[PDB]
A paper describes a structure:
Here, we identify RCC1-like domain (RLD) proteins as LZY interactors and reveal that RLD is a regulator of polar auxin transport that controls the abundance and localization of the PIN protein in various developmental processes including GSA control. Structural analysis of the complex of CCL domain of LZY and BRX domain of RLD, which are responsible for the direct interaction of these proteins, reveals hydrophobic and electrostatic interactions at the interface of the anti-parallel intermolecular β-sheet. We also demonstrated that the CCL domain of LZY and the BRX domain of RLD form a complex with high affinity in vitro and that they are necessary and sufficient for the recruitment of RLD from the cytosol to the PM. Our results prompted us to propose a model in which LZY3 recruits RLD1 to the PM of the columella cell in a polarized manner according to the direction of gravity following amyloplast sedimentation.
We found that the BRX domain and the CCL peptide form a 1:1 complex with a KD value of 9.7 nM. To elucidate the structural basis of the interaction, we determined the crystal structures of the RLD2 BRX domain bound to the LZY3 CCL peptide (referred to as the RLD2-LZY3 complex) at 1.35 Å resolution. The RLD2 BRX domain adopts a compact α + β structure comprising an N-terminal three-stranded antiparallel β-sheet and C-terminal α1- and α2-helices. The LZY3 CCL peptide is folded into a β-hairpin structure and docks into the hydrophobic groove between the β3-strand and the α1-helix of the RLD2 BRX domain by forming an antiparallel intermolecular β–β association between the βB-strand of the CCL β-hairpin and the β3-strand of the BRX domain. The complex is also stabilized by polar interactions and the electrostatic surface potential of the BRX domain is complementary to charged residues of the CCL hairpin. At the interface, salt bridges between charged side chains from the CCL hairpin and the BRX domain are formed (Glu286-Arg1033 and Lys277-Glu1047), and the CCL hairpin loop is stabilized by Arg1038 from the BRX domain. The BRX domain is folded into a compact globular structure, although it is composed of only ~60 residues.
Numbering used by the authors:
A (entry chain B): 272 to 287
B (entry chain A): 1006 to 1066
């Protein structure tokens, strides 16, 4: 993307 | 293909890769929800992207 992944309850992830 | 995590600012963890000590790539950035809202994490990336690429020696293509 980069793409944001917001499904986890402990972390936000930016997948580059 | 080595892959590892670096501690950056508190709550920010950066995953890097390299093949056999070759050029490094930025794979992902993980933000603790303890320390970041989603709005804050987006702003953090805008504010820190350039420094992250330089500090961790990833070519900013």
């Amino acid at each position: 993307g980069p793409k944001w992944v917001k499904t986890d309850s402990d972390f936000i992830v930016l997948e580059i | 293909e080595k892959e590892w995590v670096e501690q950056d600012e508190p709550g920010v963890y950066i995953t890097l890769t390299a093949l056999a000590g070759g050029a490094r790539d930025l794979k992902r950035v993980r933000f603790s929800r303890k320390r970041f809202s989603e709005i804050q994490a987006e702003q953090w990336w805008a504010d820190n992207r350039g420094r992250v690429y330089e500090q961790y020696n990833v070519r900013m293509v």
